[PDB]
Amino acid sequence: DVPPYFKTEPVRTQVHLEGNRLVLTCMAEGSWPLEFKWLHNNRELTRFSLEYRYMITSLDRTHAGFYRCIVRNRMGALLQRQTEVQVAYMGSFEEGEKRQSVNHGEAAVIRAPRISSFPRPQVTWFRDGRKIPPSSRIAITLENTLVILSTVAPDAGRYYVQAVNDKNGDNKTSQPITLAVENVGGPADPIAPTIIIPPKNTSVVAGTSEVTMECVANARPLIKLHIVWKKDGAPLSSGISDYNRRLTIANPTVSDAGYYECEAMLRSSSVAPVTRGAYLSVLEPPQFVREPERHITAEMEKVVDIPCRAKGVPPPSITWYKDAALVEVGKLTRFKQRSDGGLQISGLLPDDTGMLQCFAHNAAGEAQTSTYLAVTS
Description:
Elements: E1 5-6, E2 13-17, E3 22-25, E4 28-29, E5 35-40, E6 43-44, E7 53-56, E8 65-73, E9 76-79, E10 83-90, E11 98-103, E12 108-110, E13 117-118, E14 122-127, E15 130-131, E16 138-140, E17 146-148, E18 157-164, E19 171-173, E20 177-182, E21 191-197, E22 202-205, E23 210-214, E24 216-220, E25 225-231, E26 234-235, E27 240-241, E28 246-250, E29 258-266, E30 274-290, E31 296-299, E32 304-306, E33 309-313, E34 317-322, E35 335-337, E36 343-345, E37 354-362, E38 365-376
Parallel strand pairs: 2-10, 11-20, 22-30, 31-38
Antiparallel strand pairs: 1-4, 3-7, 5-6, 5-8, 8-9, 8-10, 10-13, 12-17, 14-15, 14-18, 16-17, 18-19, 18-20, 21-24, 23-28, 25-26, 25-29, 27-28, 29-30, 30-33, 32-36, 34-37, 35-36, 37-38
Subcellular location: Cell membrane; Synapse
Domain Ig-like C2-type: 4-86, 91-178, 193-272, 286-376
Subunit structure: Homodimer; mediates homophilic interactions to promote cell adhesion. Interacts (via PDZ-binding motif) with MAGI1, MAGI2, DLG2, DLG3 and DLG4.
């Protein structure tokens, strides 16, 4: 009479190549009989059986998504930790040839032609078979948009991209975009600082290595263009790269979160700078500070309390299951959940016997614990 439990929980995320085979396992132990069923995006994929494996002989990108297992025996049922199968692939540049036009001095903004791919491909800008590296006059954004500051006539031509998927090695070339540069009025006219690419609202899990805010500015003459970064109003003096276009935070913490501003101005000038801002949110995955005991016995018809509190950013939501089924909490029920997080059961029916599972969820993760509740008296 052993209730189910998991010997090993699967990894949260995993990347596979298209065409390769895929084996998932429900590694559990318990007392005969131990049955297993599989869920794909919370929809039944199998019914209960003796088969603990779910196998896909040949992966497709359409197989990407969430999988999990349910294990059960005559004493109860457990919901396995959910995993995300990510299928590495790369489509083609379906877009045709394009053409844009700009006047000299104006910034030329050329978005990277669309392509669907996992992971996101590495993109490199080209023109006449020559690579186009970022310069003081040429920016390539995080979105792989090509910006050409204070364009001159020789900037006109056919630009295109090459895209390489890092995990399957695929290499595609896009159709070209033809930039025309016009000549209206003298090319010596001054231009006040402009922000072509403002910072974007950006979120990162604290268990990452880097996070980058970006801001691209245009001016004439480009040489006296200066970009200052700020956090919550205060200037920053490190982590700045590109030509002051990129602000890179290493190993971000919850403290690094906040409002980041980009200010473009002319050196030794007369003018109010132009400012654009965006928030950086830093999250922590859920993590228990209070777990119920892995075996619990209460008696009919008293009330029992099962403690469960989690820690994380933002404050994680606590959700209860009984035998892999969402517990019905509410005032017309015997079950009620403290804002504390714990679960209180009143009027213990013999059928309240089984496996209870506490799930702590937030946008950056999911944690889970189980207990065996046995009714006596």
